[PDB]
Design an enzyme around this catalytic site. Structure first.
Site, short mmCIF file in Angstrom:
data_model
loop_
_atom_site.label_atom_id
_atom_site.label_comp_id
_atom_site.label_asym_id
_atom_site.label_seq_id
_atom_site.Cartn_x
_atom_site.Cartn_y
_atom_site.Cartn_z
CG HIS B 41 -0.37 0.04 2.54
ND1 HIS B 41 -0.44 -0.99 3.45
CD2 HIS B 41 0.22 1.08 3.19
CE1 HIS B 41 0.13 -0.61 4.58
NE2 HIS B 41 0.54 0.64 4.45
N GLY B 141 2.91 5.90 10.11
CA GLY B 141 4.25 5.81 9.59
C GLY B 141 5.01 4.56 9.98
CB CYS B 143 2.85 0.54 7.52
SG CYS B 143 2.82 2.22 6.80
C1 LIG Z 1 1.16 2.75 7.08
O1 LIG Z 1 0.13 1.95 6.54
C2 LIG Z 1 1.15 2.55 8.60
O2 LIG Z 1 1.75 3.27 9.31
N1 LIG Z 1 0.38 1.44 9.12
C3 LIG Z 1 0.34 1.08 10.52
C4 LIG Z 1 -0.31 1.99 11.56
N2 LIG Z 1 -0.19 1.73 12.91
C5 LIG Z 1 -0.88 2.76 13.70
C6 LIG Z 1 -1.46 3.72 12.84
S1 LIG Z 1 -1.17 3.33 11.31
C7 LIG Z 1 0.97 4.22 6.70
C8 LIG Z 1 1.21 4.39 5.21
C9 LIG Z 1 1.17 5.89 4.90
C10 LIG Z 1 0.02 6.45 4.37
C11 LIG Z 1 -0.01 7.81 4.11
C12 LIG Z 1 1.10 8.60 4.37
C13 LIG Z 1 2.25 8.04 4.91
C14 LIG Z 1 2.28 6.68 5.18
N3 LIG Z 1 -0.39 4.62 6.99
C15 LIG Z 1 -0.58 5.77 7.84
O3 LIG Z 1 0.39 6.33 8.25
C16 LIG Z 1 -2.02 6.23 8.19
C17 LIG Z 1 -2.73 5.60 9.21
C18 LIG Z 1 -4.03 5.99 9.53
C19 LIG Z 1 -4.64 7.02 8.83
C20 LIG Z 1 -3.94 7.63 7.80
C21 LIG Z 1 -2.64 7.24 7.48
#
Ligand SMILES: *[C@@](O)(C(=O)NCc1nccs1)[C@@H](Cc1ccccc1)NC(=O)c1ccccc1
Ligand SMILES: *[C@@](O)(C(=O)NCc1nccs1)[C@@H](Cc1ccccc1)NC(=O)c1ccccc1
EC number: 3.4.19.12
Lengths: 299, 299
Positions: B41, B141, B143
């Site tokens: 993703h 962040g 993930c």
């Molecule tokens: C990742 O999917 C991520 O951090 N997943 C695990 C989590 N654990 C606790 C909260 S989230 C990021 C990918 C991403 C998306 C957009 C911008 C930067 C990185 N997803 C998120 O950070 C995110 C979570 C919840 C809502 C919006 C964005």
């Protein structure tokens, strides 16, 4: 989300750990630039009441064997500073991080890298208890393992493990070789004093729990600093200071719960217990998270 | 002495963590030999129901930016395997440890290195819960952070973090990109099932407590496997198998307490509680230590 007992990444320390042998005593050492730091009782066989000065007299540089993984190091100098030995070696550790030696205060937390024969086994988070012991997990051969904090790229070494007390708790020095608390590096009649709970840390964990969804303990009451400290003295909690109230400010600001309102919640938890509920997965009040630890983890 | 929740030293993993950016999405990646593994993703902006295949179509190698500290890596290939992307880069990671990818079973424990923007923040121990979630500590962040075990010099990667469920628990994949449990990498109506307690682990922690001086829970009773499993079903503990009894053998042998005698102690703790006492510093029964974890730590 989630709140867990979290240590700093240990890599920068792993590269510093070596094995030091003197005669038949092997323990762990810490190699920074061209000096290897280890507990001074590496020169001992005795432990009842060693004259460390006179034991160091029979020893020369070539009597200390330092092994970093498989790299054998050449010792070109040795000295005693308090309860540590400093072994000058002919090579700088290429792996030396940016570092500082710090003497921490009771209440402050740090990560421990448990080592045996110069090799890391595990990492966990600890606190300097008010009675200047730490509740670690250490086995024979663990002496010389170190505690540290990491701010950005800088490693702040604060602890060297020396000894286990008959109570099963652990005692040790800063990296200048001064023990925390009254302990001596002898096998004598020494025992931990009163261990008290670290009030400022409990409050910070209460704040961590609100940030993460646990709010059943939040009450419709408040209290005063003097009133709360009467309750804390009864329950063998450390007195809370205006310095402590000020350190909790950022957490108060985030959650919108005034420190004195959280104090009244803790008050009620102390007089009533948890009645079979849990907070952040624990049925006991936790005191090994500093306010800095809650902010770092929750941000 | 002491028993603590201990993670593996994280250094070998820290050297593998990189930052992956695609368009405006930045997350963490895992660099092993000449491949960087990250959640798929990273190619998303959407999350309701992404057609990952069609999103990957608009992307070429030069659209993926991989940064290892400050070293910019050159991407020469990309593929999707299940829910991960594999980015072929033109340089092998000189820091690559000996490693294996492993799909672990519920009940097994592992260390997590939480990362943000390719940089490690902390290390903690976790378990794959019976409902195939993990109770981590993860923020936006995080993930791409990974879970692992370390046997000798070999890193066994078992988890890549992807997502946080509305319940505040965490879900993710093995390093082949297959999720643990039923979860999908979408923001949909998915929720954790029944989380049950890991009986074999609780017993092993009971053994750890005896080794370390806590014995008040040891009773003058015994029980049978079928009798105990009736109690476990009532208290939403996993059923205990003869395979579990066999794995606890070494701990039984060390302490001289038969597994079925320990089962009767756990039985009484389940029907009576702890009556305000603690075991190894906890007022709750702990199920995130495997039998292997107790032996490794206590030896
Ligand atoms: C990742 O999917 C991520 O951090 N997943 C695990 C989590 N654990 C606790 C909260 S989230 C990021 C990918 C991403 C998306 C957009 C911008 C930067 C990185 N997803 C998120 O950070 C995110 C979570 C919840 C809502 C919006 C964005
Ligand atoms: C160290 O002093 C040491 O491991 N100290 C910390 C401990 N934590 C839990 C138990 S001990 C070593 C030095 C040494 C001495 C002899 C041989 C090899 C190393 N002390 C011991 O390992 C030791 C402890 C208790 C009794 C005998 C020996």
């Amino acid at each position: 989300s989630g709140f867990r007992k979290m240590a700093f990444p240990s890599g920068k320390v792993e590269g510093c750990m070596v094995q030091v042998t003197c005669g038949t005593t092997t323990l762990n050492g810490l190699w920074l630039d061209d000096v290897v730091y280890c507990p001074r009782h590496v020169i001992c066989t005795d432990m009842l009441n060693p004259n460390y000065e006179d034991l160091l007299i029979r020893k020369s540089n070539h009597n200390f064997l330092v092994q970093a993984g498989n790299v054998q190091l050449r010792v070109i100098g040795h000295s005693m500073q308090n309860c540590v030995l400093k072994l000058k070696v002919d090579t700088a550790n290429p792996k030396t991080p940016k570092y500082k030696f710090v003497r921490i205060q009771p209440g402050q937390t740090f990560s421990v890298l448990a080592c045996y024969n110069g090799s890391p086994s595990g990492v966990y988070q600890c606190a300097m208890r008010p009675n200047f012991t730490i509740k670690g997990s250490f086995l024979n051969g663990s002496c010389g393992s170190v505690g540290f904090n990491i701010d950005y790229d800088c490693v702040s070494f604060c602890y060297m493990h020396h000894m286990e007390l008959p109570t099963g708790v652990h005692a040790g020095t800063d990296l200048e070789g001064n023990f925390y608390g009254p302990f001596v590096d002898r096998q004598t009649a020494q025992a931990a004093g009163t261990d008290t709970t670290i009030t400022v840390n409990v409050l910070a964990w209460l704040y961590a729990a609100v940030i993460n969804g646990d709010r059943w303990f939040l009450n419709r009451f408040t209290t005063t600093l003097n009133d709360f400290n009467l309750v804390a003295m009864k329950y063998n909690y450390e007195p809370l200071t205006q310095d402590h109230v000020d350190i909790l400010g950022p957490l108060s600001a985030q959650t919108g719960i005034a420190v004195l309102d959280m104090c009244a919640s803790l008050k009620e938890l102390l007089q009533n217990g948890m009645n079979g509920r849990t907070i952040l997965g624990s049925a006991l009040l936790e005191d090994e998270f500093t306010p800095f630890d809650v902010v770092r983890q929750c941000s």
